[PDB]
Amino acid sequence: MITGGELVVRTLIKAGVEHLFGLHGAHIDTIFQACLDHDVPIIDTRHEAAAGHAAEGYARAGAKLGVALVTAGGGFTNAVTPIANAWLDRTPVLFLTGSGALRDDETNTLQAGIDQVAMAAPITKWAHRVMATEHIPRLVMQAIRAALSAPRGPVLLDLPWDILMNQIDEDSVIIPDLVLSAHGARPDPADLDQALALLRKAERPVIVLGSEASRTARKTALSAFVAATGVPVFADYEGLSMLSGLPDAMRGGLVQNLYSFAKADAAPDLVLMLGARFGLNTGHGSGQLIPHSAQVIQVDPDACELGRLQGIALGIVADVGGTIEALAQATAQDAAWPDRGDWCAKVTDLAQERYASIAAKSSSEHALHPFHASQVIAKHVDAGVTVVADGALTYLWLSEVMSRVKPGGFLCHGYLGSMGVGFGTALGAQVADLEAGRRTILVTGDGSVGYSIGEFDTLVRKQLPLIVIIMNNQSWGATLHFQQLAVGPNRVTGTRLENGSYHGVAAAFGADGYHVDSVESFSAALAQALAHNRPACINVAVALDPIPPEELI
Amino acid sequence: MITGGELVVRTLIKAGVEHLFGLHGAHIDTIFQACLDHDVPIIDTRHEAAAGHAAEGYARAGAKLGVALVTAGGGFTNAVTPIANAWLDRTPVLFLTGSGALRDDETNTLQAGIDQVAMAAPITKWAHRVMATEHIPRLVMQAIRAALSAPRGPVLLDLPWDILMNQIDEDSVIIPDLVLSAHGARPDPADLDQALALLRKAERPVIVLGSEASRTARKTALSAFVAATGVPVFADYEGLSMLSGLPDAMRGGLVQNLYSFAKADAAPDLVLMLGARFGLNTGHGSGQLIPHSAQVIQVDPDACELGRLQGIALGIVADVGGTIEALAQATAQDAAWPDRGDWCAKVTDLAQERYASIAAKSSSEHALHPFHASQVIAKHVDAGVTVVADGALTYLWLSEVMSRVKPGGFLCHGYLGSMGVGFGTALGAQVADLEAGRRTILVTGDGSVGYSIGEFDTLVRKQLPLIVIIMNNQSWGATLHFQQLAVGPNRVTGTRLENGSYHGVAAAFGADGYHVDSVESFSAALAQALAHNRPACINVAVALDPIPPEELI
Amino acid sequence: MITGGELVVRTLIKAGVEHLFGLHGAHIDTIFQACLDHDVPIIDTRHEAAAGHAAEGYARAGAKLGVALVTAGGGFTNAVTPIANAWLDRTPVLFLTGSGALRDDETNTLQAGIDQVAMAAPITKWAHRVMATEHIPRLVMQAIRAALSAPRGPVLLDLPWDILMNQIDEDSVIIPDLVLSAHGARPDPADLDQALALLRKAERPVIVLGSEASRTARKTALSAFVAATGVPVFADYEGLSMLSGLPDAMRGGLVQNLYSFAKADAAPDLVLMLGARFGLNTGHGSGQLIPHSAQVIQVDPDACELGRLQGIALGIVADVGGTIEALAQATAQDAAWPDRGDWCAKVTDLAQERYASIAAKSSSEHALHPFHASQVIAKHVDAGVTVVADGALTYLWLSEVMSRVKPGGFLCHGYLGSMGVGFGTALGAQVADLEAGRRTILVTGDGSVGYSIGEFDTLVRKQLPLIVIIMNNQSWGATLHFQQLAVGPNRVTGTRLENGSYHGVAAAFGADGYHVDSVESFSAALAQALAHNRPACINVAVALDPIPPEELI
Ligand SMILES: Cc1ncc(C[n+]2csc(CCOP(=O)(O)OP(=O)(O)O)c2C)c(N)n1
Ligand SMILES: Cc1ncc(C[n+]2csc(CCOP(=O)(O)OP(=O)(O)O)c2C)c(N)n1
Ligand SMILES: Cc1ncc(C[n+]2csc(CCOP(=O)(O)OP(=O)(O)O)c2C)c(N)n1
Ligand SMILES: [Mg+2]
Ligand SMILES: [Mg+2]
Ligand SMILES: [Mg+2]
């Protein structure tokens, strides 16, 4: 005789999950008991939103399934921002929630009576309420299959208190394996051929990676394909870390710096989009990054994304990882590829030029320029580090130093653009980075850090050595800029935050707190915090007036 | 200057659509005007349900996109049953609906004020309301891409009266092409290898086809793969017609007759499921058709379906058509395949034995046995015929004669099990069959025909030579059987239909009407109607008491 | 030991329901068995849509709860149009639906796996799935209270097959009474005073009744209020029959004929709206019926409706029935009311003038004018007759003769404006009219009758003596008019219906069939059918070209 909670955890074990992120409630205590018995850690936070964002972080930074665990009612409703974020970001999280007992349904009782499945339906791949304890294993496994397959996304499994506490005889119900191929589907040989023929006869070809390249992590395949063709590779934020293993001469970097190419007479001839959607990060349908004049080969698992905002030449529905593999295989059997050395140097030179351009207009005459601050962070970024970015102006500036470095992970806002998401995200990422030997750095704004500032307590309780760097410009920055730029100099309201010692908050939570206002003071602080196996907060006084290039766009 | 309706039709044209199925309304009259101008026929019915099912029938029988067109309000709400059916049936239909003008939203006006998108969300791949006339082309095309890619399914595009009537200058908005590869994704080489290895070392292997094999229609690939391996092939209803081109010795027929295999000591060793889900048609998780002892290779575009009710050996998420192609390609390069002649003969003999078994207990001592009736239909079934089946007992009987024939199409109930769906389905099918030179026969129940009996008018108006065969047992038959069988002999209520001359109704609508009660009278009637390029109704008096084998299950 | 189906029926009994309207299915057979045992008739139709509309008709014509009963899957989806119609019409129907068993949820099984509750949520007052058999009584009763209270509306109760078949010991679960006051809430005395003060100092005051006056049927109170004040009373379609008991001199008739009042210098001074919403029937916010210059007193149970499209003077949220009562009570204690005889005559004269105006332009030079046809129906309309109206042009013409007669019921399209709804509606109404001794006449279009033409069978099987009058103009009339009027003379497509003997269809179903083409032939036919306790169809050949005054609007 065992509980439905046991059933959940036994299935999670068989799926290979090793960590869950949650906040306790009576409704879901059978899952806690089971995890205690099985030595499965639940990283318990101070807010369900932080718990959900940790699950995302864990998934995004480890390329794993993330699992979030929340109680009925407010437990679920506090998880909604994570679910929506993961939905837009194509990130694989199983959200497990409690709900009211099915017996005594519709009795106006504690934490019951909200349609949690209806609320999640618009923003999950699947959302469903379990009706019987016996169904737990097959439904947990089905939810996980939905989460993990292309395009990845969140799933909500709602488990009534009733269903969880009820006891059945183990050995009346079978726990299935996760039987799902790890290699995705790949293009038809004729599409691959055509794609390769177009790639071969292009003068200025370019590859753009998006989130699905990251989720599948086919690093050795990518790098064989890139080495054979010499075609320079860009990424949106989520795909960036997939460039870390490529040879320098073909790291184009973040797609944004594709911006100035047209006016340099170097607008790409052809673009191979591998899970990079037409939208915010790729410049919508504007043709400012992905030129209207270019032939586009788009590979996405969702047919809707294929040429959504712009005409394309070849539309392939397939898995991105499977496709990368296929390109490598076809390309190992090839080796008649034109040089592209000149084109690669041009790509390199343009990225380099934007950087030096920015550098030529940055200061400290009584105050630290956000670009200078980002540079200080940049010199510590390599494959042994995951960078998590939050807070508008902060990350638009940070982005300019991200292309020339090679992070193990880079986790920035997706389409949701939700301020505050970073803290939970970074905490989940650090958990995943512990097995891989990486340090997680969170770079956030003074506004954004306030959303989840209580997580400092969690960092100390759980001994997670996350470094939280706050770019402190005394304001909701991008948003203050909008008011001045779009309305007028004296139209600034509700956008100032001229109060609060954030390092003191961290100190009062047990975390090491630093405050800095200079290139040299910040440098020393970050170095000292990296040297300690200890969580930290670095409160960086930074100038507000400078406008990052990406903002004017 | 052109209308939003023009924009819709121009985009449909470029997608290659050649017929729409609808019922007129003022709200959507711009689409009618445009179709009139471009010579695009709209097949207008007597009920939006019939229109919607016609779109299904056209898609299912032509392996094409089907397009339904309904007005705001009741237009949409009448279309809901077709949407749900297509959803469960993985059938590609674009449902185009009017809705209230966005200007004067929330003014309690005619046909406005129901959230049509919210209603369709639970049963569509995508459902969305267009907000601007300029968006019409990219959104129509996006909707079509979603409909057509794996697994196929319905899509609802809601077009406000406002948005449709409003005029823009053509040449300010571009009409995209349909750029979407026609070949689906295929398995990773290593998964294919493993699948083929398991297939090669099996003793009693079996292939089971489901709806996706049918949507992709890779007939020449399938038959090359079957010819190379000699592996017998079964299908659920929707997959059946895909067996019409295979050599007889490997036509297992409908999956149901896999039922008696276990007790004959011939339970399959291995089963290759190509788009056949675990569910109603495959015997759920019971192992009565797909044995628990068998190794299962499942190929489905939705990872959810992979081993949903039962353990599997290999779970591949890929397109079924692309998979079939890949198996043919790998299998042309092979030709070292074990005989399977004995096994195929065994498959053959079991199917044949079930048939003769049924035949040995069927009569006419004053009344025509439903099996004998089905046989009369069978002798007219070949590649030049699409059979559409409705009505419970009718189709459970019909199913027993469908395995030994080779129809160009077989369209039966799917998971929805919705009585009455057949009439509109057969009407759409007949439209698709006209270019292919086929005849459509509908075989339906006296109950089910009453759902859409007015479509006889549409047959006559539109000169569609459909033959409507009514198995008339004076009742909602299966449903009456349930009452006697599950409750008791004198517990029959609301299930009798002892009234109504259905051939008369057809005659009053201008269609040729026949009434028959015998093997010989029915035979003559069907032959005569097949000989005429004319729609017909054949009212067949048939016995009620007999229980089809499938019913006891 | 008893079934959940028993529980449903026992609770329905205690609520006082005496008829259900449904179509049988195995999933809901426990309800059929129970009704058979308790002598509760289920009127079984040929389409769930018809069943649902019958429930509406029964409720709308009897001022009762209507109860509809449909099976899982297609049974529910076919009911959707009735649900939506009842939603916009504020009509009290309990929709009881089957759904798949909760055990074996998510097994891809027959008729399961569509989120029926999600589909109904956007168009019900409450929609809910029952989780335990013990909950059936309290939940049925809850559903009924929701349906019956102000503003009335449809409710969906979803009862899994599981839940219905499962057996419990009766006497372990109590069946509650319907304990819900029959008298609605009434306005605060101060609001009533103010309303009465404004009404007393008005020069040209007017009352407009809507659906909620009809649901509560406070006939004796209304007529005491009207007799005390001498204030003329109008109604939208649904409120019309509430005018049948009032003195002639204060019967303004349908609100539409308030149209010409402004240009006659007689635009109302003040309007007391009793459940009449701003919307389609009251001319939206246009002030063509409810003048912008008038002081408006609006009484509605939904605060949202209060001045939704137009400024009002006094907004009261209360029940319309309770309010009418309160006005009668306050007004019995009053009797100092200004004359209004002149104003009433003026109202009378305007209505009369519109009628004579129309009459002066109607013909038969080879063809029967729709107006003349309506007049033939009018001479049989009194308190002993319920009129049901369908089909666009048909009812816009019929409406012009409705003001001067006094029907026991008038059931016309509401906001949904869904063609075809009439047939089931009239069938339900005739069931309700049987206890009250009334005859039901359906007046419908040739288009609309096609939607549910099979119900002629149901009329014969159930011996319901409905008379179905088809205004046959060989077309979807209003819709063809729109094309000529809005697009052009030769822009007529998919709007013609030049085929089909509708009377023949009725005769083939066992109903008396007539066809007529003249004032005198129609007159004889209608009289003969009224004389027989028998269902009938009168196919009326009617001219198409005439444009009803309401159409130009
Ligand atoms: C949850 C959420 N709240 C508000 C906003 C709107 N918003 C866009 S930028 C911004 C704030 C910037 O704050 P900060 O973290 O201080 O970063 P800075 O721009 O100062 O670097 C706000 C409020 C949002 N996108 N998401
Ligand atoms: C829309 C719908 N209504 C009701 C049912 C329940 N049902 C199962 S079998 C059956 C009807 C069979 O009647 P008929 O069309 O005459 O075929 P028969 O079995 O009588 O040959 C019904 C009504 C359903 N599955 N779908
Ligand atoms: C279900 C539905 N279908 C279509 C329309 C659009 N429409 C406006 S009136 C009308 C048809 C008129 O029907 P009929 O019964 O022939 O009316 P008449 O010819 O008497 O005007 C249609 C189709 C609608 N409002 N609802
Ligand atoms: Mg800031
Ligand atoms: Mg039957
Ligand atoms: Mg008509």
Place of tokens 């409706």: C305
d(CA B164, CA B103): 12
d(CA B68, CA B54): 8
Amino acid identity of residue B99, one-letter, is S
Q: Is the peptide bond before C154 cis (omega within 30 degrees of 0)?
A: no
d(CA C128, CA A232): 56
CB B377 within 8 Å of CB B407: no
Cβ separation A138–B309 shorter than 8 A: yes
Cβ separation B142–A308 shorter than 8 A: yes
Search chain B and give the residue with CA nearest A146.
B304
Cα angle: A177, vertex A86, A19; to 5 degrees:
45
User: Which residues 6+ apart lie within 8 Å of C38 measured at CB?
Assistant: C9, C10, C13
What is the side-by-side order of every strand in the sheet holding A155-160?
A42-44, A20-22, A66-70, A93-99, A155-160, A126-129
* CA-nearest residue, atom 11 of ligand 1: A476
User: Which residues 6+ apart lie within 8 Å of C517 measured at CB?
Assistant: C367, C368, C540, C541
Compute how many other C-beta atoms are within 10 angstroms of the C-beta atom of residue A241. Answer: 27
Per DSSP (E only), the strands in C412-541 are 439-445, 467-472, 512-516, 536-541
Query: Maximum Cα–Cα distance for chain A, whole Å?
Result: 74
User: Which residues 6+ apart lie within 8 Å of A282 measured at CB?
Assistant: A208, A236, A255, A273, A276, A289, A290
CB C351 within 8 Å of CB C252: yes
Which burial class, exposed, middle or buried, applies to B517 when counting CB atoms under 10 A from its CB (0-12, 13-18, 19+)? middle
Compute the radius of gyration of chain A from its Cα atoms: 24
d(CA C58, CA A1): 53
Domain A362-553 carries which CATH code?
A: 3.40.50.970
- C-beta B219 within 6 A of ligand 3: no
- DSSP label at A507? H
Structure tokens at A321: 């990882």
The resolution, in Å, is 2.6
Query: Which helix (H) or strand (E) segment is C93 a member of?
Result: strand C93-99
Query: What is the phi/psi pair of residue A194, to 5°?
Result: -60, -45
Which of C445, C441, C456 lies closest to C420 in space, CA to CA? C445
Cβ separation C106–A142 shorter than 8 A: yes
Distance in Å, alpha carbon of C99 to nearest chain A alpha carbon: 13
Method by which the model was determined:
X-ray
Which of C404, C410, C409 lies closest to C251 in space, CA to CA? C404
Which of A105-112's residues contact partners 24+ apart within 8 Å by CB, and which partners?
A105/C131, A105/C132, A105/C135, A106/C128, A106/C135, A106/C139, A106/C142, A110/A73, A111/A25, A111/A27, A111/A71, A111/A72, A111/A73, A111/A74, A111/A75, A112/A72, A112/A73
Search chain C and give the residue with CA nearest B32.
C493
DSSP reduced 3-state for A360: coil
Cα angle: A299, vertex A300, A306; to 5 degrees:
85
Mutate to test the interface with B, among A145, A218, A298, A302 (most CBs of B within 10 A): A145
For helices B393-402 and B370-378, the axis angle rounded to 10 degrees is: 50
d(CA C284, CA C291): 11
Strand pairing report for A439-445 and C205-209: unpaired
Search chain A and give the residue with CA nearest C127.
A115
Q: For residue B28, which ligand has an atom nearest its CA?
A: 3
User: Which residues 6+ apart lie within 8 Å of C225 measured at CB?
Assistant: C324, C327, C328, C331
- C-alpha dist (Å) from residue B392 to B254, B380, B414: 17, 22, 12
Which of C363, C417, C425 lies closest to C392 in space, CA to CA? C417
Query: Maximum Cα–Cα distance for chain B, whole Å?
Result: 74
- DSSP label at A316? E
Query: Maximum Cα–Cα distance for chain C, whole Å?
Result: 74
Mutate to test the interface with B, among C19, C117, C396, C493 (most CBs of B within 10 A): C493
Which of B429, B374, B369 lies closest to B399 in space, CA to CA? B374
**B528: region left, alpha or beta (phi > 0 left; psi from -120 to 50 alpha):** alpha
Structure tokens at C418: 């869904």
CB A20 within 8 Å of CB A188: no
Structure tokens at A347: 């790509």
CB A469 within 8 Å of CB A539: no
Q: Is the peptide bond before A151 cis (omega within 30 degrees of 0)?
A: yes
Going from N- to C-terminal start, the domains of chain B cover 2-181, 182-361, 362-553
Q: Which chains pack against C, by 3+ Cβ pairs within 8 A? A: A, B
CB C214 within 8 Å of CB C242: yes
Burial B380-411, CB ≥16 within 10 A → b, else e: bbebebbbbbbbbbbbbbbbbbbbebbbbbbb
User: Which residues 6+ apart lie within 8 Å of B133 measured at CB?
Assistant: B4, B7, B163, B164, B166, B167, B168
Query: What is the phi/psi pair of residue B387, to 5°?
Result: -105, 130
* CA-nearest residue, atom 6 of ligand 2: C25
Superfamily assignment of B2-181 in CATH?
Thiamin diphosphate (ThDP)-binding fold, Pyr/PP domains (3.40.50.970)
Which of A478, A482, A538 lies closest to A506 in space, CA to CA? A538
Distance in Å, alpha carbon of A506 to nearest chain B alpha carbon: 44
Which of A42, A17, A119 lies closest to A78 in space, CA to CA? A119
- C-alpha dist (Å) from residue A203 to A314, A339, A340, A343, C193: 18, 10, 8, 8, 85
**C526: region left, alpha or beta (phi > 0 left; psi from -120 to 50 alpha):** alpha
Task: Give DSSP secondary structure letters for C354-381.
Answer: HHHHHHTT---SSS--HHHHHHHHHTT-
Strand-pairing partners, residue A439, are A385
d(CA B264, CA B250): 19
Amino acid identity of residue A451, one-letter, is Y
Strand pairing report for A205-209 and A233-235: parallel
d(CA B503, CA B427): 18
d(CA B62, CA B299): 23
- C-alpha dist (Å) from residue C76 to A365, B482, C47, C53, C455: 72, 20, 11, 13, 19
Atom of ligand 3 nearest to the CA of C482: 8
- C-beta C256 within 6 A of ligand 3: no
Told to judge if B18 belongs to the known catalytic residues of this protein, a careful annotator would answer no
CB B147 within 8 Å of CB B92: yes
Distance from residue A419's CA to the centre of ligand 1 (Å): 5
CB C208 within 8 Å of CB C271: yes
**Which residues of chain C have a CB within 8 Å of the CB of A102?**
131-132
d(CA C233, CA C212): 15
d(CA B135, CA A309): 10
Strand pairing report for B2-3 and B167-168: antiparallel
Find how far residue B330's CA is from the centre of its chain.
Answer: 30
Cβ separation B306–A145 shorter than 8 A: yes
CB B464 within 8 Å of CB B431: yes
Helices (H) and strands (E) in chain B — how many of each? 21, 20
CB C443 within 8 Å of CB C394: yes
CB B269 within 8 Å of CB B292: no
- C-alpha dist (Å) from residue C145 to A552, B391, C16, C213: 58, 37, 13, 18
Domains B2-181 and B362-553 share a fold: yes
Cβ separation C108–B278 shorter than 8 A: yes
Which burial class, exposed, middle or buried, applies to B361 when counting CB atoms under 10 A from its CB (0-12, 13-18, 19+)? exposed
Fold of A182-361: Rossmann fold (3.40.50)
